[PDB]
Design a protein around this ligand. Structure first.
Ligand SMILES: OC[C@H]1O[C@H](O[C@H]2[C@H](O)[C@@H](O)[C@@H](O[C@H]3[C@H](O)[C@@H](O)[C@@H](O)O[C@@H]3CO)O[C@@H]2CO)[C@H](O)[C@@H](O)[C@@H]1O
Ligand SMILES: OC[C@H]1O[C@@H](O)[C@H](O)[C@@H](O)[C@@H]1O
Ligand code: NA
Ligand code: NA
Ligand code: NA
Ligand code: NA
Ligand code: NA
Length: 490
């Protein structure tokens, strides 16, 4: 159950250079005696918050930075505090990708963007526009080939087209990503997904194509182009394909806008090996030799470490990666990114299969992306459970005393005064309060992490309110005052 002291367990995705990373772990063990176990479990980014919530999981978790705000909201990550001399060794924008509510919550490793990858023997002059792909596919179909195959099961790969003409995830305004301003169903997003769906309708792509299908077709010379990231180049090198890496096609005259990911390494808040983890990441991995060992296994892309990036930048494939990154933008790291991705995944699959029109698929995704996160819903349920336990006490107290108040100016002391990061009190001053009614109110101790209050009456009718000035630190035994932006709990 508990993480073992005196060892490092690392999780990293199966498309990355995990054998190269294990070589870094071997060097760490030679120098320190500390064994390093690198694992690449399936769905590691979903497993981590499940097991880390209980104090389990790896010491170190690797993923793109977009997952990390959610992990931090759940209290799963240790704060990262590099010395200034170390911080200056990495590009500032990579630290900003892993900065959440003022704190660094991971070490940045590498900067990833998708590029267009093309077979130079089939296609010495690849297209500059998406619009010319249908004609090109027709020519290649006459030769027993196809123009383009890429993973249609993951929204990461289709997003650059959706974003090109105006799609966006969350608008950045007034100094934050605004989770109420989602750009998934505007005209530009609809234009881009419509074009992808048109390609499928016209048999230029097949809706069922996934990562392995598209990789095999490209690496076997059956399709002229694919869309993928630097991690994919290793398997192409093994193949007989002479490939180039270039800027993504434009759509309606505008660049495709890939979402740029920073592969990042966080430290589990429950790890008893935090100082060893920091030494591994700072002094072994984030060095020219450490990144090289990973890069030799599967290319990292551009790296966050300035010294090594100066070498990698001379590789034309890295120059092309950077060109596409410059036309995209950094993913937000905020907790809501999970809801955004799951929503767009379903939309693309549904529109591409014909199960829904583009308009209906994206209208649903727009709603789902802005809807209450899984964290918020779980928190509300868990806080409500604590309210129910206190309500049970209130009814026990009532039977014992004939009223809900202890005295005319004092409420009885509750059995569950804190739960799930909320303080819980009776709501309303006791003076003049009626004898056969009560209200319980739960307020967050950390109101940036849990920006809502929950209140419940004696018959368990519950409201969630997003605006309240109440504070758990005000030194009082009750709450008073009105809440705003309230909605019935169902
Ligand atoms: O689609 C469901 C999927 O949504 C979320 O996954 C997203 C990743 O969080 C995001 O980083 C990006 O993933 C790509 C990696 O950055 C890249 O290094 C490489 O591994 O390819 C990945 C894409 O397959 O985009 C995906 C969305 O496609 C969410 O975190 C997942 O739990 C969920 O399964
Ligand atoms: O939406 C479902 C997807 O999200 C999660 C996992 O990473 C994927 O294996 C899964 O297909
Ligand atoms: Na340091
Ligand atoms: Na910090
Ligand atoms: Na923000
Ligand atoms: Na690289
Ligand atoms: Na470039």
């Amino acid at each position: 159950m508990k993480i073992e002291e005196g060892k490092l367990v690392i999780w990293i995705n199966g498309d990355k250079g995990y054998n190269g990373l294990a070589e870094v772990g071997k060097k760490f063990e030679k120098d320190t005696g500390i064994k390093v176990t690198v694992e690449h479990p399936d769905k590691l980014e979903e497993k981590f918050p499940q097991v880390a919530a209980t104090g389990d999981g790896p010491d170190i978790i690797f993923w793109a930075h977009d997952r990390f705000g959610g992990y931090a909201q759940s209290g799963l990550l240790a704060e990262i505090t590099p010395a200034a001399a170390f911080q200056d060794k990495l590009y500032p924008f990579t630290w900003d990708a892993v900065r959440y509510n003022g704190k660094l919550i991971a070490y940045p490793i590498a900067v990833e963007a998708l590029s267009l990858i093309y077979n130079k023997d089939l296609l010495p002059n690849p297209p500059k526009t998406w619009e010319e792909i249908p004609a090109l596919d027709k020519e290649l179909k006459a030769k027993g080939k196809s123009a383009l195959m890429f993973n249609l099961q993951e929204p990461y790969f289709t997003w650059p087209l959706i974003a090109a003409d105006g799609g966006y995830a969350f608008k950045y305004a007034a100094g934050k990503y605004d989770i109420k301003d989602v750009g998934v169903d505007n005209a530009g997003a609809k234009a881009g997904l419509t074009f992808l769906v048109d390609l499928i309708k016209n048999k230029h792509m097949n809706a069922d194509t996934d990562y392995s299908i598209a990789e095999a077709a490209f690496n076997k010379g059956e399709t002229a182009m694919t869309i993928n990231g630097p991690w994919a180049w290793s398997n192409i090198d093994t193949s007989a394909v002479n490939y180039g890496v270039t800027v993504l096609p434009t759509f309606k005259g505008q660049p495709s806008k890939p979402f740029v990911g920073v592969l990042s390494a966080g430290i589990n808040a429950a790890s008893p090996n935090k100082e060893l983890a920091k030494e591994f990441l700072e002094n072994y991995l984030l060095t020219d030799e450490g990144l090289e060992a990973v890069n030799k296994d599967k290319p990292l892309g551009a790296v966050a470490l300035k010294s090594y990036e100066e070498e990698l930048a001379k590789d034309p494939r890295i120059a092309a990666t950077m060109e596409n990154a410059q036309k995209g933008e950094i993913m937000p790291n905020i907790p809501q990114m999970s809801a955004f991705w799951y929503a767009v995944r379903t939309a693309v699959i549904n529109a591409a299969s014909g199960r829904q029109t583009v308009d209906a698929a994206l209208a649903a995704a727009q709603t789902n992306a802005a809807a209450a996160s899984e964290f918020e819903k779980a928190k509300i349920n868990a806080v409500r459970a604590a309210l129910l336990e206190n309500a049970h006490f209130m009814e026990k107290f009532y039977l014992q005393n004939g009223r809900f108040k202890q005295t005319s100016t004092k409420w009885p002391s509750l059995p569950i005064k804190e739960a799930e990061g909320f303080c819980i009190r009776l709501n309303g001053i006791a003076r003049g309060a009626l004898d056969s009614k009560f209200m319980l109110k739960a307020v967050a101790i950390d109101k940036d992490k849990n920006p809502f209050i929950i209140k419940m009456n004696e018959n368990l009718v519950t409201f969630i309110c997003k605006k309240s000035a109440s504070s758990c630190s005000d030194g009082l035994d009750y709450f008073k005052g009105n809440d705003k932006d309230c909605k019935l709990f169902k």
